[PDB]
């Protein structure tokens, strides 16, 4: 099972204390490392890669830059995935990974139960309930459910009750549940929206394209499509162009550069934009506190802004300023 | 050890549902179930479930049903036995809003309250990734002979009583022992093991007697 | 797992004695109830009795008669469904029987569906359970057994048919099998026959079909089977309706060269026997399982022990039996239900 | 702590896979076209996908006899004649049978079960699918039983006679010491019937 982000913080007042302290450090200027180390610390990162979404790439750039600014001595070695075994051997001080599939679970459990490596889980902010004895060093991301609720609140404004929509999920797993089913449930509960169809995808632009075609060929009568990730959203944008259905509103999920360009063209109508660099900065601040023998919160979530195609190019530019403060340089 | 019996008991309970869930996952990939969404041929569907429950009695749910994205499109007709009318079935469908997780549900029926573990699973079209709808499985815990017999037999305790808060819902008592269920409830080595569903502790407890 | 009927009685010698005692009371003339009751007993019957087979119709007729002749004060709620149909009605009737706290619920056990219902009634405080048309106690339920399993042992009757086909036909004879629907009946009637015929006579099974336990379903499976495997000398049918459906199929295709059995020997089967349309059947001494139930209830009311299980007996009947032989069997079989 | 639940769970897992696979269009199709490559790959998929829950051998029959087996049976002493008698011994479907047979390379202790292969539209029984677990020298199962029950070692015994164990060979004891150090006895129940089989755990 999973705790909800706020649920976890409410359940553990000490964890809210700690998450608030981290949010503040992330906000304020870099206060460099108190305890210098004997060696350079070793960090392995295993990320998705080959994505139109720049989340992972920008996250590393934001992470390294904050590490440099805090005066941490690190050896960072990275892998982007088209072997977790090949990562295990390198005996690192901090492993940065993700958790979406049951395949990731299997590994994380093994890493938690049979190693010493401090584990950071990126793109999940909902602690596993069964691990309350031995939680990962840090869950860090932009809370999927919060972002979906924000998109849901907006759609709930643009369309009257009983409006028709379809859903393009991620691949099967955690992301689909917390982005897709969260949105479905709220919009159904609150707005009496009616779901016509839903499709799992292969988490690529190609499959995003294919799924939208398949969806619209079978259920042409929707007012919007909700997409659960960046690449899937942009695939669906093409399919909508091709079929000439820009009467159909569609969202992005994350608000990276490629999404922002598409927003500005009116290819995407709305997105939930994450203050991207904060989670790269959080992981550096978390590593620093660890090196200073300070307690580190189990969970960190960054903030979002809602972005629409109606927004000024100045609004967009001011958001790119906050969100990519590090990874844009 | 009181904690070793408690861990044993929860492992048995957990592995009973883990097997029902494996079974449900697996059968839910059937082409017959998939095709039902297009064909709506109820003879073919019923024959199929008849066939898998004959193959596996101890892992068959008490009742099952199919939905699309608006509602229940088919039920197996078993739920009525347990006081679960159409109305209450819908409420079950609506309470289970996430896939691949057991939900503990306590509902009132015209014959009393019913205590159930219910889960859903998406039915996909593997050539498109389309979610055609959902398959639900419900286990009724009330007077659940087979589960009381598993807990007793595989833990080597003498008897079990399942309670909600502390109304008795099921037990393994033969009727020839020094004690009845009421005596067990009155808290000779009786051990309380709380029932955890989806990593959250429920109102249910297993009481073991040695 | 199930205990075989004799296997169960050999395992618990006390049960043999109880069953023996019950057979005597069924054979003998009615000794009325010796302890009158403060109110009528509430009896609920839920049977798949809407069939061409009169087994369930006659089981209740004879049961009621004996209850009458036993001076037992009762109320009987009776619901009949089609096999594999009226599912909602069946679940509702069972629910209503338990809700109204029937003293006896009379039901059956063929499928996992029936089994699940029965498992939920086992620890009942108010309702005793009689399972008709099964005589093989469930092992898992030892020490929590229903009040009574009552019927005509499916295996014994299949053994008797298998012995007879073993004599009619030469080794390596080709046959097909029309089962009931999936479940206990198909397993104990069908697989018993197949097994014995294969090991004792090397008969060679050419095809087998599960059916929907109906005439139409028997017709359809018979036609499909013979289309693919026309070269069989006999068809073993696992039930009455299925057999009579197959009868229509062989006629439609001009094929009474193929021998076909019935299973049970009620009125419609007997008419088809004497007409030449069925070649053989295993005939149940029908009314004994209705009577055994009434006698079992009487004993419970007089606070006597009641056997866990009771099986009646069969006679073999062929189309070469005299109108004399049948008529005399009908007077044994339908002693209450015909009267 | 009980290996009883883990043991039973293991065979329940095997059974669930077998029931499900036997409903596959792949197996139904093999009855008509006999493409042994398609079939062998189908079972390769499932096997490497779940190496922990797979029978030591499989075979298929039609009503006349065995039409295919996976090649594994003979390595256990289960020759064509013995395979044939196995098929006939397992005369009811959907149930585990505990079978012990003499082979030319020693006694063999097995659990066998069959499931009918049906046309889901016509109701035809095409034949049966069997799965067998050889218990003798089943190291992987012994290893699973050992680690999942947090005990030091496990020995499987058929009527006081060892037939499999998890011993590494370096511990301050042998299998003989186990049969006469805390050893516990857990008898095996098959299809509601207690068998001669017993699991001996050590801590
Ligand atoms: C970070 C991310 O989560 C899923 C996918 O990996 C992603 O990169 O795509 B996205 O920008 O919607 O969000
Ligand atoms: C009693 C019975 O068992 C199955 C079916 O219900 C039946 O009526 O058909 B039959 O007469 O062969 O026997």
UniProtKB/Swiss-Prot annotation, chain A:
This protein's record includes keyword Signal: yes
CDD domains referenced in this protein's UniProt entry, alphabetically: PBP1_LuxPQ_Quorum_Sensing
GO molecular function: DNA-binding transcription factor activity; transcription cis-regulatory region binding
Cellular compartments per GO CC: periplasmic space
Locations listed in the record: Periplasm
UniProt superkingdom: Bacteria
Keywords: Periplasm, Signal
Role this protein plays: Binds to the signaling molecule autoinducer 2 (AI-2), a furanosyl borate diester, (3a-methyl-5,6-dihydrofuro-[2,3d][1,3,2]dioxaborole-2,2,6,6a-tetraol). This complex then interacts with the LuxQ sensor protein.
UniProt similarity note: Belongs to the bacterial solute-binding protein 2 family.
Record protein name field: Autoinducer 2-binding periplasmic protein LuxP
Organism: Vibrio harveyi
Curated annotation (Swiss-Prot), chain B:
GO CC aspect terms: plasma membrane
MF term (GO), any: phosphoprotein phosphatase activity
Compartments in which it is found: Cell inner membrane
Domain of life (superkingdom): Bacteria
Keyword Protease: no
Record note on quaternary structure: Binds the complex formed by AI-2 and LuxP.
Protein's name in the database: Autoinducer 2 sensor kinase/phosphatase LuxQ
Organism: Vibrio harveyi (Beneckea harveyi)
Residues of the full protein shown: 53 to 270 of 859
